[PDB]
Structure 1
């Protein structure tokens, strides 16, 4: 539903267009001042898209999910306890060869080798074949993945979705601003 913009007070005195809660988080755990588990979770799926697009593994398909379980000890990471990488592929590739390729080409280049011990458990497509996915597999709505966007489970969240909102709405800009002040305080 498109409308028409209208047409003298102080611009900085504009009130918030809607109420809400915004949370910003920052920790010196990582270089980019972010929780470690969420960063490496993003690396795996980002690596999957990178490998699929450049042609290293042509049989990959866009849909993919990752899940990394980190083992802390006195507040410091000492290893990785479980890695889950569910990816959509084509019917051409067999299941056994998919696990070998995904492990060697996605998990190995990303995660540090010292964390992956023999006690680490890998779950690469635990169910089986994953050929038809994407929108057909499940419905998709805007703002249903807010936690994986911001920090994962490491930090509290206000509950306001980001995507599809212009900066004038505090549900998005204030969350960016809260992260901005949180990062500067830690930095």
Structure 2
């Protein structure tokens, strides 16, 4: 049936995403020294200040203030004219610290479930709305940092409404792009530049018609942004972090958490499964639901929803997942080789659909395709 579907993303300068990146920068700095550390780092940013809090158990010694200032500086807040300055904002630490047979048989601590999702409607096997929303704010940051549009400032949001028909994309119905900018540029010039340097190189021409609506800084000037007059907190962008609303989400933020937190690592594993099923050609689109029982390691149930797109029977998919992936809480950590400082890169522009992340590798695809008996 014909319908619209919308997703959004936000730049690395958005205050919630600032907090995510600081949490994962702290996490990465600890993991570099202590790969087995327990970290639950929650950040709060607002006018003039960063508060980094939470709980860690580690042998690592890290300078929270330096990590914080370096992270905000890299994002681009370096002057009070932008609303925020990495060099002169307040940084407060409130982190409680503590000192540090078959480990893979560790059972789950909760009744829980995890969702994964993939679809061959894009090259990265992600839903088109979240993919192109991500790409729009990532492009905003790129042309900001490389000097193409030097008047851009870090804070930006995007939103894309796709039209579907019979489950395939027909085009883009509406685009929102709001970006922070310096005082000197006028809105008409800004809108033309955003169209030419951000929107047009990112969105396929075939999907843009004369009916497409473009809302580029629709309320006009956007000089002050980031944390200034606007709070950011770790874990308040969990839908832009994942699938943009296209898939179900069981709850649980990612950033600031070490891989032992099932909320993060099991979600990564569930994406890994779904992406490899679709890359194998076993379905065009796939939502996986992994259920865990308190005190047992293997998932208690694995449901593979294929939305009628399956190329083999649905029971065969469940069995293939049982055979080729280790979805035990600690086994998936080993499968994905997660005990490394790789998380700051995940904390803006999406945890899924990205290049080099281990849960985005399609290295079980051909094995699954063979095992299911097709070519």
Bigger mean CA offset, 157-166 vs 21-30: 21-30
Q: Distance in 2 between matches of 1:17 and 1:54?
A: 46
Give me the whole-angstrom Cα distance separating, in 1, the residues matched to 2:190 and 2:116. 39
Higher relative contact order (CA 8 A, sep 6+): 1
1:95-116 superposed Cα distances (whole Å, 9 cap, x missing partner): 1110011111100111011211
Change in 2 beyond 3 A, CA 1:18/1:91: farther
Matches of 2:140 and 2:229 in 1, distance apart? 19
| Cα distance in structure 1, aligned partners of 2:110 and 2:181 | 43
If you compute each CA radius of gyration, which structure gives the higher value, 1 or 2?
2
State the partner residue of 1:138: 230
Q: How far apart are the structure 2 equivalents of 1:18 and 1:165?
A: 17
Q: Which runs of 5+ in 2 are unaligned?
A: 1-95, 279-375
More strand by share: 2
Deviation per CA, 1:85-128, whole angstroms, max 9, x where unpaired?
00000111011110011111100111011211110111001111
Say which SS state the counterpart of residue 63 (structure 1) adopts: strand
The Cα shift of 1:10 comes to 1.2
Question: Does structure 2 conserve the Cα–Cα contact (< 8 Å) formed by 1:16 and 1:169?
Answer: no
CA RMSD of aligned residues (A): 1.2
CA shift, 1:16, in A, is: 3.3
State the TM-score, normalized to the length of structure 1. 0.94
How far does the alpha carbon of each residue in 1:35-65 deviate from its partner, in whole angstroms, 9 at most, with x for none? 1111101000000000000000000000000
Cα 1:18–1:169 change in 2 (3 A) is farther
Q: CA deviation at 1:17?
A: 5.0
Instruction: Supply the distance in 2 between the matched residues of 1:17 and 1:76 (Cα, whole angstroms).
Output: 40
* 1:144 partner SS: coil
CA distance in 2, matches of 1:40, 1:34: 10
Task: Give the paired residue count.
Answer: 183
Structure 1 stretch 18-27 or stretch 111-120: which is displaced more? 18-27
2:372 corresponds to:
none
1:20·1:160 contact (CA, 8 Å) conserved in 2?
no
Deviates more, 1:176-185 or 1:63-72: 176-185
| Structure 1 gaps, min length 5 | none
Shift of 1:138: 1.4
- Cα distance, 1:20 vs structure 2: 3.9
